[PDB]
From a paper:
The replicative DNA polymerase from the hyperthermophilic archaeon Pyrococcus furiosus (Pfu) is a member of that polB family and is used extensively in biotechnology applications including high-fidelity PCR. The resulting variant E10, derived from an exonuclease-deficient version of Pfu polymerase (with mutations V93Q, D141A and E143A) and with additional mutations in the conserved A- (V337I, E399D, N400D, R407I) and C- active site sequence motifs (Y546H) was able to efficiently PCR DNA while completely replacing all dCTP on both strands with cyanine labelled dCTP (Cy3-dCTP or Cy5-dCTP) giving rise to highly-fluorescent products, termed Cy-DNA with applications in advanced microscopy applications. In an attempt to better understand the molecular basis for the altered substrate specificity of Pfu E10 polymerase and generally gain a better structural understanding of the primer-template duplex recognition in this class of DNA polymerases, we have solved the crystal structures of the apo Pfu-E10 and a Pfu-E10:DNA binary complex at 2.4 Å and 2.9 Å resolution respectively and compare them to previously obtained structures.
Pfu-E10 displays the domain structure characteristic of DNA polymerases, consisting of an N-terminal domain (residues 1–130), an exonuclease domain (131–326), a linker region (327–369), a palm domain (370–450 and 501–586), a fingers domain (451–500) and a thumb domain (587–775). The final model for chain B is the most complete, but is missing amino acids 612–614, 669–675, 693–695 and 757–775. The two molecules (chains A and B) are very similar (rmsd of 0.8 Å for 690 alpha carbon atoms). There is a slight difference in the orientation of the thumb domain, which has a slightly more open conformation in chain B than chain A. This is likely to be due to the different crystal contacts in this region. The structure of apo Pfu-E10 is very similar to both these structures, with a superposition rmsd of 1.0 Å and 0.9 Å between Pfu-pol and Pfu-E10 (molecule A or B respectively, 685 residues aligned), and 1.0 Å rmsd between the Pfu-PCNA and Pfu:E10 Chain A (694 residues aligned) and 1.5 Å for Chain B (715 residues aligned). The greatest difference between the three models is in the thumb domain, especially in the region of residues 679–730.
Residue numbers in the entry: 1 to 611, 619 to 665, 677 to 688, 724 to 757
The structure:
């Protein structure tokens, strides 16, 4: 399988290198056949003779066009002729662009700024991470001695921990009595040990959490001071710092450095992205945290190093376990987009769509649009985008609530109404659909570029999903599930990509229309559900609705909802489709994006209603949702505020674990005095509880 691809310069010529793994053996395949190029669109094709001899410059040398070739291409569907100007080196493209474009006969040039290594994979039709191979994965993390606001690297590396399928160990240079700790002469030898472990294990993928920014640079500066080369690459090379956007990543030749931090960021949203939080959110079970001050005290003492060696071992053990869960997802992406995992895992979802479309463009013989200019880029970043329909909810405490929503709404709209730049207001178009309120017309004679790709993606997902019912092989079933996750993520990225400033296939009109159509069909369901079925819609947001039959029986509401989805789907066009998603026993709605519901199992879901103060507002939700008693909830608030004045509540519950609030905290460096009360009522209890009770017409006066 193809793991990575770069290129090196030999005697002025570009040489591609395909880093591979085949039959459990590593090999590098060189390729000197490929040639970089750019496209030229001319007024007059006879003027090509003048364009052929246009000269450029680089490092004082003379850069010229080595070959030219006439080719038929498509541009936004419409046929077009272009000249393929070949060059010696990829780095000749900027200078040849500058001067070829200045020619009066040349109208524009295209596909001039695609990196050479990625150009090779697209053109050769090479997809990385294909086939079945036993890839060896290894994770690692490091513990450092921090002291003072000091330079990055002055503190010695206290521990280097690592973990794989078989084991999880710690390498250090102090006497510790643990069975997974390995003691060594000094820091220098600790680093040399780590190099031996990487050498013996010889991993295909090295996994870190935040390795680009912290672990590799800190190891490198340390290794520089100690006079020791980091022979981590499979050709003995050191880790190389490389840039992409506003990020400096770390590269390892022969292997794939997989930094987990970048994959978790664009996927799920959390308050903070610590290694402990991410582990708990994913796996459920908790992970203890040891802090810098605890490490600094225990290290210089010589005792209490068992606690730090535990934390360091678990850092490596957790990173491996997270890596094992997110890597199979990411290899399917890289296999779906068709670029290497090093790049794909550090790419934003908008840029992953770009690399997908550039590959597909080549399969369809179609010329890509250029990146926007700096003036065009800043223009797009200024414009605003109108969101989905949100309704001001019906207030009060409601019973037996059904939630209905659309399946893949925006993708289904893009396919049904053929929404893309190449079909926008097409000249000489026979049959077209008009977007509501915005009036943009999309041609439906031929399926466009993006709508056709997306339609195929959703087809392939259904095949995988159907085959998953059938399969009994657990390895296949889990493989299919990731393939299905990868396609889904990629498919939901297309909407956002249309409004993405940097995108080549940018189309605000397409994005306006997708949102506009979404608002039409949500309101259609709203009208059809309240008139023909007699329901009362409680709240609507973007692609889903909460509703019920006020005072109606629980079992009847479910039945009439399951009937409505069958009905409404007969009216909805193409891929548009509604589904029965869930049922709730009770629920109330304060305002937009602010509500709380409760399922039949008693589990209480919330949104917008967030942070003794956290305990009370949780106790308020329970008495409202479980028992349906708003008056009882008010008594609880009156009881809690009374305990604050009389101090009947115990200590510690009033404490907060974290120039500002830390004025008295800075002094601590080296039964009584329980006076705080007004603070806990005004700043903590009321703001949390009022957020809920405002919907039922209560004020600060009622509580206080």
């Amino acid at each position: 399988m193809i793991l990575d691809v770069d290129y090196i310069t030999e005697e002025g010529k570009p040489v591609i290198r395909l880093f591979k793994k085949e039959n459990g053996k590593f090999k590098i395949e060189h390729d000197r056949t490929f040639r970089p190029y750019i496209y030229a669109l001319l007024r007059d094709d006879s003027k090509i003779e003048e364009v052929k001899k246009i000269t450029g410059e680089r490092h004082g040398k003379i850069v010229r066009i080595v070959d030219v070739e006439k080719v038929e291409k498509k541009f936004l569907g419409k046929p077009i002729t272009v000249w393929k100007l070949y060059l010696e080196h990829p780095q000749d493209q900027p200078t040849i662009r500058e001067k070829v474009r200045e020619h009066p006969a040349v109208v524009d040039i295209f596909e001039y700024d695609i990196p050479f290594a990625k150009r090779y994979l697209i053109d050769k039709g090479l997809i990385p991470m294909e086939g079945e191979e036993e890839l060896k994965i290894l994770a690692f993390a490091i513990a450092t001695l921090y002291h003072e606001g000091e330079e990055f690297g002055k503190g010695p590396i206290i521990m280097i921990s690592y973990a794989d399928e078989n084991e999880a160990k710690v390498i250090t240079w102090k006497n510790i009595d643990l069975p997974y700790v390995e003691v060594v002469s000094s820091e220098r030898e600790m680093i040399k040990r780590f190099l031996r472990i990487i050498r013996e294990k010889d991993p295909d993928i090295i996994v870190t959490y935040n390795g680009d920014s912290f672990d590799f640079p800190y190891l490198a500066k340390r290794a520089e001071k100690l006079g020791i080369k980091l022979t981590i690459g499979r050709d003995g090379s050191e880790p190389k710092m490389q840039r992409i956007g506003d990020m400096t990543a770390v590269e390892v030749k022969g292997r794939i450095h997989f930094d987990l931090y970048h994959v978790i960021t664009r996927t799920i949203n959390l308050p903070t992205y610590t290694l402990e939080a991410v582990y708990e959110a994913i796996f459920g079970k908790p992970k203890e945290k040891v802090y810098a001050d605890e490490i600094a005290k225990a290290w210089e003492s010589g005792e209490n190093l068992e606690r730090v060696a535990k934390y360091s071992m678990e850092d490596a053990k957790a990173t491996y376990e997270l890596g094992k869960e997110f890597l199979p997802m990411e290899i399917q992406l890289s296999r779906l987009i068709g670029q290497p995992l090093w790049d794909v895992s550090r790419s934003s979802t908008g840029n992953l769509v770009e690399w997908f479309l550039l590959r597909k463009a080549y399969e369809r013989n179609e010329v890509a649009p250029n990146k926007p200019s700096e003036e065009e880029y800043q223009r797009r970043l200024r414009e605003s985008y109108t969101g989905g329909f949100v309704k001001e909810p019906e207030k009060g405490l409601w019973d037996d609530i059904v939630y209905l929503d659309f399946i893949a709404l925006y993708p289904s709209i893009i396919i049904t109404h053929n929404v893309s730049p190449d079909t926008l207001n097409l000249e000489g178009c026979k049959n077209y659909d008009i977007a509501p309120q915005v009036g943009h017309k999309f041609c439906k004679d031929i399926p466009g570029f993006i709508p056709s790709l997306l339609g195929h993606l959703l087809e392939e997902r259904q095949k995988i999903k159907t085959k998953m019912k059938e399969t009994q092989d657990p390895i296949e079933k889990i493989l299919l599930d990731y393939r299905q996750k990868a396609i889904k993520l990629l498919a939901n990225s297309f909407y956002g990509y249309y409004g993405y400033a940097k995108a080549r296939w940018y189309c605000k009109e397409c994005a306006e229309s997708v949102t506009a159509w979404g608002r039409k069909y949500i309101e259609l369901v709203w009208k059809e559900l309240e008139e023909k079925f007699g329901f009362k819609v409680l709240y609507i947001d973007t692609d889903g609705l909460h509703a019920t039959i006020p005072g109606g029986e629980s079992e009847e509401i479910k039945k009439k909802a399951l009937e409505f989805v069958k009905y409404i789907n007969s009216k909805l066009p193409g891929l548009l489709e509604l589904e029965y998603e869930g049922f709730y026993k009770r629920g109330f709605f304060v305002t937009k994006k602010r509500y709380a519901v409760i399922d039949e199992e008693g589990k209480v879901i919330t949104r917008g209603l967030e942070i003794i103060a956290k305990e009370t507002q949780a106790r308020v939700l329970e008495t409202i949702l479980k028992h349906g008693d708003v008056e009882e909830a008010v008594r609880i608030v009156k009881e809690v505020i009374q305990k604050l004045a009389n101090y009947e509540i115990p200590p510690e519950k009033l404490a907060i674990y974290e120039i500002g609030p830390h004025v008295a905290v800075a002094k601590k460096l080296a039964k009584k005095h329980k006076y705080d009360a007004e603070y806990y009522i005004e700043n903590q209890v009321l703001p949390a509880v009022l957020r809920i009770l405002e919907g039922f017409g209560y004020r600060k006066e009622d509580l206080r």
